[PDB]
Amino acid sequence: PVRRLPFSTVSKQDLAAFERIVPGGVVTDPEALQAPNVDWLRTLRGCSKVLLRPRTSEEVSHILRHCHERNLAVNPQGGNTGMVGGSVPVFDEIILSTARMNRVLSFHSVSGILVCQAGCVLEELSRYVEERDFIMPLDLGAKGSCHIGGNVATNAGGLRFLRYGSLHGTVLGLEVVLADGTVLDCLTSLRKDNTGYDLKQLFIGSEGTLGIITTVSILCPPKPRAVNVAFLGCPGFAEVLQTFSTCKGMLGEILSAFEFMDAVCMQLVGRHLHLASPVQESPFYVLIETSGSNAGHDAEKLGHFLEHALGSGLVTDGTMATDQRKVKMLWALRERITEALSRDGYVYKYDLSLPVERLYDIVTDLRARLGPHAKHVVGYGHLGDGNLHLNVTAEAFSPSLLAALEPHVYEWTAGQQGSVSAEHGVGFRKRDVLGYSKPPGALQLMQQLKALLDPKGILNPYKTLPS
Amino acid sequence: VRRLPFSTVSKQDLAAFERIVPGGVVTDPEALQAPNVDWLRTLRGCSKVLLRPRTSEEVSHILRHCHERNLAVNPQGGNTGMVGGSVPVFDEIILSTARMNRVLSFHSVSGILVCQAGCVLEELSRYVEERDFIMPLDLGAKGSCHIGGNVATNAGGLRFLRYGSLHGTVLGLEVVLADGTVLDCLTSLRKDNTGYDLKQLFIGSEGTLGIITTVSILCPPKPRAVNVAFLGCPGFAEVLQTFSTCKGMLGEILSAFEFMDAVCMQLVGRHLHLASPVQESPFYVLIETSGSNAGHDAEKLGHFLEHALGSGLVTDGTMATDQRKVKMLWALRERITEALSRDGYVYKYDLSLPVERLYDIVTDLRARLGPHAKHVVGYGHLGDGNLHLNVTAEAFSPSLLAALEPHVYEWTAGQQGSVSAEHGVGFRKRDVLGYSKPPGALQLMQQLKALLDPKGILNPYKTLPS
Ligand SMILES: Cc1cc2nc3c(=O)[nH]c(=O)nc-3n(C[C@H](O)[C@H](O)[C@H](O)COP(=O)(O)OP(=O)(O)OC[C@H]3O[C@@H](n4cnc5c(N)ncnc54)[C@H](O)[C@@H]3O)c2cc1C
Numbered sequence A: 001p002v003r004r005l006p007f008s009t010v011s012k013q014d015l016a017a018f019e020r021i022v023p024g025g026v027v028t029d030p031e032a033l034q035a036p037n038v039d040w041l042r043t044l045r046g047c048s049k050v051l052l053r054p055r056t057s058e059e060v061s062h063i064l065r066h067c068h069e070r071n072l073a074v075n076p077q078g079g080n081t082g083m084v085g086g087s088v089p090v091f092d093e094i095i096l097s098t099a100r101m102n103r104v105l106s107f108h109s110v111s112g113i114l115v116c117q118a119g120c121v122l123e124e125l126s127r128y129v130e131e132r133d134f135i136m137p138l139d140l141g142a143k144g145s146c147h148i149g150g151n152v153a154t155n156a157g158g159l160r161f162l163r164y165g166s167l168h169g170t171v172l173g174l175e176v177v178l179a180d181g182t183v184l185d186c187l188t189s190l191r192k193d194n195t196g197y198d199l200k201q202l203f204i205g206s207e208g209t210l211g212i213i214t215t216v217s218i219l220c221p222p223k224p225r226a227v228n229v230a231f232l233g234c235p236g237f238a239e240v241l242q243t244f245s246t247c248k249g250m251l252g253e254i255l256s257a258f259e260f261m262d263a264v265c266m267q268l269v270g271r272h273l274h275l276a277s278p279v280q281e282s283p284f285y286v287l288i289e290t291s292g293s294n295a296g297h298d299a300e301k302l303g304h305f306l307e308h309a310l311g312s313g314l315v316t317d318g319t320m321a322t323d324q325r326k327v328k329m330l331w332a333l334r335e336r337i338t339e340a341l342s343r344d345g346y347v348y349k350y351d352l353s354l355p356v357e358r359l360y361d362i363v364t365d366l367r368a369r370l371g372p373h374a375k376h377v378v379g380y381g382h383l384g385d386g387n388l389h390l391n392v393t394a395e396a397f398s399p400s401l402l403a404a405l406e407p408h409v410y411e412w413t414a415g416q417q418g419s420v421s422a423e424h425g426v427g428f429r430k431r432d433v434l435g436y437s438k439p440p441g442a443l444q445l446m447q448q449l450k451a452l453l454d455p456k457g458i459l460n461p462y463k464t465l466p467s
Numbered sequence B: 001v002r003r004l005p006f007s008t009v010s011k012q013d014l015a016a017f018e019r020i021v022p023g024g025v026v027t028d029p030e031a032l033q034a035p036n037v038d039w040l041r042t043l044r045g046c047s048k049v050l051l052r053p054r055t056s057e058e059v060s061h062i063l064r065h066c067h068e069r070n071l072a073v074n075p076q077g078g079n080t081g082m083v084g085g086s087v088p089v090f091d092e093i094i095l096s097t098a099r100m101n102r103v104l105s106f107h108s109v110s111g112i113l114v115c116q117a118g119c120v121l122e123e124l125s126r127y128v129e130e131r132d133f134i135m136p137l138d139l140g141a142k143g144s145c146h147i148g149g150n151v152a153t154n155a156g157g158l159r160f161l162r163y164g165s166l167h168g169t170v171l172g173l174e175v176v177l178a179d180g181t182v183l184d185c186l187t188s189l190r191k192d193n194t195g196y197d198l199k200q201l202f203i204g205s206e207g208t209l210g211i212i213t214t215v216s217i218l219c220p221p222k223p224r225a226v227n228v229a230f231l232g233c234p235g236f237a238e239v240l241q242t243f244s245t246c247k248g249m250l251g252e253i254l255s256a257f258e259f260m261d262a263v264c265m266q267l268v269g270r271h272l273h274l275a276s277p278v279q280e281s282p283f284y285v286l287i288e289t290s291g292s293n294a295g296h297d298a299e300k301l302g303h304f305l306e307h308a309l310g311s312g313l314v315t316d317g318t319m320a321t322d323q324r325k326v327k328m329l330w331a332l333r334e335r336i337t338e339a340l341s342r343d344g345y346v347y348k349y350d351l352s353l354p355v356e357r358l359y360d361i362v363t364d365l366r367a368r369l370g371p372h373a374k375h376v377v378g379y380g381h382l383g384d385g386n387l388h389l390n391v392t393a394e395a396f397s398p399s400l401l402a403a404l405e406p407h408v409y410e411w412t413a414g415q416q417g418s419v420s421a422e423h424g425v426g427f428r429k430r431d432v433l434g435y436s437k438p439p440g441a442l443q444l445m446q447q448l449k450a451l452l453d454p455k456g457i458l459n460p461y462k463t464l465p466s
């Protein structure tokens, strides 16, 4: 397995130092450390003996100062919803939680610029800005637990990426505490600013290996006057692809989401979450969201789109909603697939960028390659962005199934010049499969960046660069 | 200010470059005159060698040689940059991307364009528009600027309000590092979270961390309907309320919101012989929309104009959808900087400020300089909080400079603003970044420069503080 690097260990003197630095924010009880030591998938468990819960940036600076002097490894943690083992310790790394860094600093009701602490929960920020007629530029099924700082650190994609784009575009600024405790102020709450290198970009998607994000400045789109959702059954993946093409051609700028899922996804959400399907049974389903300023115009656009889709046989059955309750019910069928999967058994999870025309090939292939050894195989996800969520469920983990899946899936993906981690990132699980998507020289430059910014390697060791 | 201890180009270096780039070694002093002078004609180098590589490998071998020989290199694109970054200070070798102008691929479904860094922006716009796509950025310099220079400077421009930053729209880069190492981050994927987003370091790095040789970029679909409204507003309060109403009533179809004052209109009319299409007003607003249903857009515009004219925010306005008149109206805005450079010496500031006080500095400067300036103008990308502030004089005055600087930068800092929103830093602004950046940021910038280019051969005297 992996070998523990020669870090120090937490002493009683370290515990007293942390008690000084963050009064009331030191958790040492072994039973309390159980939950923060286990990842969301429940397949990785750390042995951390101390949880720190600072409230302020200065406390994070001082914690890291101490850990730097003492050579203590630190595991940053947000909502602990990450999918790649990046969020929990491997050995006895200190868990530094942002749970209590949950304050909004300011919100400007004209520019739409939000500034908040890294540990603000995404759904709560959404409620906050929606009260002021804005929205968050990203959303995901983990919204109820994930922290904005986690989202920035993982460069989270999500359900409205197609409309508002990457955090690399929507993050306006960051405050980041470096491994030695230096507070890096890149908190430029300005729409535009070309005064030197865009240092904050290094910390977007770096998963806590280059520094700990403590404050975020983010551009919030205006809240749309009109939101529509359509949920459609398609008789094959070719019709899904043509439905996408037609959807872009007829809805255009009002399109805010395009998600697909297969029949098995629908069956699992129905069986485990008791969610009835609102359309006729089909081998594929598509959820489309639109967001716009004029309800009448959006309705005309959608009506004509539906007319054409049903006319040319791209869609066999479809339903539409504007009522918030019904919209949420329809969205639940897509958002909760991952939960139903984790309720179905042990989950093998792959998050791939592929040519959209070939997005589903791997699922049919794996259904053939695997047999009754797979309990289920599913494909779903962000088709508009070329992003497939591939999942295999089984009664239990088995080495034989892992050996059938890997490296086969990663070589198929490399054969398509795809990404073996479209959005979930690298972390612990994928640290040794980056060669399928990144050339050696890039990986080396990444290693040099790590050495420059964290020469002691105390920030999230065993991740997210190759060994 | 003072020349760093770089080597000097010998006859053997010339013979090596002739081996590396046959046909691409320019040493004629008269041919070297134009590439040594920046667009503003206020900086002029003494470079004696211009290199014009064709391929990425030629660039790699050139930089390998310069690394072994400790020769400074000045990358140059279209040479339209505004901050003295694009021309040597002394005798840096000018490496031009002029011949690196081929498109490599374009995926007719994803809209992803892969092209060499020296492709001119206008030409790329033509290419992708022939295929029903558009570039995610546009600039007044479109006719000359290179996509490599746009990425190196993180160019903003006239459709930034709709499509946003190159940090979002650039999908991949091939970069040649100072020692010749070719860094391949030339992915063509919409989403790829397999490690650090290294390409981001080179977007806005102004050639100090590496030479961009290949760009992969996401082109938005070409709009079915483009509309432009050119409106006259009786004051800046009404400009700001017009902006708010525009966002409320046009929404997602909005693709541009630009403003200019009366003096800008007078200067473009005088020097460029472009007549105003609207009544004389203290302020003018150019609104562009882009949409998929021309009728819905036209209806939105109708209701917007009716409301704006009815509530007194706009006094008189003209709209255009014909491509020719659209380009005429856009020309009234795009060529202001040229009319200014024909009015005499130009003091140029590019500031990010709170939109609600975007114009306050123009009024302040007009009171502060009164008759010692020829003109003070404010215009630009109001939707993005970005003011272009220009002062013209019949000739340069150290007096007027002392009146403008540091005052303007201090004012900006007082607004927690940016002293260079878009155009960047280059040579001109290397020592005024402290008004927008704290010392720890600038130090980390210097550490990255030292990691990527320890000899400092790439673009010396830029773009970090002295
Ligand atoms: C139901 C569900 C749906 C999801 N949907 C999506 C989706 O649509 N798109 C998508 O991209 N992902 C999705 N995810 C996974 C996604 O990575 C997480 O939901 C989220 O982005 C991470 O937030 P977090 O606070 O839980 O981070 P954590 O899991 O706590 O940590 C993530 C990583 O970043 C580091 N980190 C955390 N906080 C900080 C910080 N403040 N500073 C520095 N480093 C830090 C951690 O060390 C770790 O390596 C989903 C997950 C679930 C469970």
Ligand SMILES: Cc1cc2nc3c(=O)[nH]c(=O)nc-3n(C[C@H](O)[C@H](O)[C@H](O)COP(=O)(O)OP(=O)(O)OC[C@H]3O[C@@H](n4cnc5c(N)ncnc54)[C@H](O)[C@@H]3O)c2cc1C
Residues within 6 Å of the ligand: B039, B074, B075, B076, B077, B078, B079, B080, B081, B082, B084, B085, B086, B087, B097, B117, B138, B139, B140, B141, B144, B145, B146, B147, B148, B149, B150, B152, B153, B154, B155, B156, B157, B158, B206, B207, B208, B210, B211, B212, B213, B334, B337, B338, B422, B423, B426, B459
């Ligand atoms: C009329 C006019 C209008 C303009 N409008 C705008 C506007 O709306 N928005 C805006 O942001 N800017 C605008 N600009 C200025 C803008 O910075 C440049 O026009 C544009 O960004 C491209 O510059 P360029 O291709 O000429 O690069 P150059 O001027 O040749 O170079 C600019 C800088 O980038 C570096 N560089 C160039 N090519 C490369 C390369 N391949 N690799 C690495 N480094 C490189 C150079 O060393 C230099 O430091 C305008 C300029 C003019 C003259």
Ligand SMILES: O=C(O)CC[C@@H](O)C(=O)O
Residues within 6 Å of the ligand: A141, A158, A335, A337, A338, A349, A350, A351, A381, A389, A390, A391
């Ligand atoms: O669990 C998964 O594979 C996908 C989860 C998440 O990224 C989603 O978009 O639903």
Ligand SMILES: O=C(O)CC[C@@H](O)C(=O)O
Residues within 6 Å of the ligand: B140, B333, B334, B336, B337, B348, B349, B380, B388, B389, B390, B422
């Ligand atoms: O020269 C200027 O002040 C601004 C130039 C350019 O960014 C423009 O938008 O006109």
Ligand SMILES: [Zn+2]
Residues within 6 Å of the ligand: A157, A158, A381, A382, A389, A423
């Ligand atoms: Zn996802």
Ligand SMILES: [Zn+2]
Residues within 6 Å of the ligand: B157, B380, B381, B388, B422
């Ligand atoms: Zn500009």
